[model samples]
Target: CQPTRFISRHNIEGIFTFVDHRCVATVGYQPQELLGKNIVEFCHPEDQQLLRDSFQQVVKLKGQVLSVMFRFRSKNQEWLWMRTSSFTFQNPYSDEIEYIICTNTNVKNS
Candidate 1:
């Protein structure tokens, strides 16, 4: 599990992903709340483009693994910096590329 106490992982701060008509989160405020909220709800408007780009890279290349840094507003309105990198593979059991399993490590030093 990712750092739930991290500002970015708080219930109000998350990055949302939707695949195959289902919504998901790479990290969560709480383990129990994992798929309950969409991450984009708290995404800074400025980071939307970057997030879209990241998604494009993943889909366009069929998979991607790179570290990316972006700023998002926390629940308290503080601008939280996140350096997330992910690696994905075509899920042999699923046809959806977006359903690839991945993990993200938030860089605190960044």
Candidate 2:
């Protein structure tokens, strides 16, 4: 159901790709400009390793939601607090992993 996260819509040609090579959706940024870009590009350099760990876990489980706390740089360069969670589910028609779900929320007030 819900959308992934606040990915930049400015470009999507360099953004991250799914396990099956599908493109990750962009929010305010264009998808093509960010297609090959890492999904963690918006994350703080200091927080990348931690998010990387969780991302790997998400891929490994193939059906679990991994939640992590991190900060993202807004279009204006402000770092905003956010929590990202992802879930995976098997495809009913095939043996491949197909269902991926994730969401992003603003926690600046926290």
Candidate 3:
């Protein structure tokens, strides 16, 4: 039931502050369990910088949405290569970035 795409919201520091039910299906982590966890903690060390670079571009471009690929650790301890599109949530009044909104999808190998 559309489990491939999952929604998530991360704090400016990239902590998993919120996630939808699909996160459980996609990443094998319950929504509640993912909270307060650093997103990088679930990422492969080699791909951590990909996550970092994509986030930097989102903030740098201001309004541009970015798509990035990385390996995310699943509940069964498997590395699932996935792609995510993300953008920053900025405060209209203060122009301060509040969160990073993301939609994650599993990347199937050809």
lDDT of 3: 0.84
Candidate 2, residues 43-87: lDDT per residue as tens digits?
Answer: 889888887777667667756767778876755567767776665
Candidate 1 global lDDT: 0.45
TM-score, each model? 0.54, 0.62, 0.88
- lDDT for 66 (candidate 2): 70
lDDT of 1 by residue, 1-110 (tens): 44422222212123433222111222324333434454455457888667656644654555566445665454445656666554455657988534323333334653
Please list the residue runs of candidate 3 whose C-alpha ends up more than 4 Å from where it truly belongs after superposition: 1-3, 93-96
lDDT of each: 0.45, 0.56, 0.84
Q: Candidates ranked by TM-score, best first?
A: 3, 2, 1
Deviating ranges (above 4 Å) for candidate 1: 1-28, 32-34, 93-97, 100-102, 105-110
Pick out the ten consecutive residues of candidate 1 with the lowest summed lDDT: 4-13
Error of 3 at 67 (Å): 0.8
The candidate scoring highest on TM-score is 3
How do the residues 1-110 of candidate 3 rate in per-residue lDDT, one tens digit apiece? 45387999887677888898988778898898889988888889999987877776777767578888889999999999888899887778895655789999988756
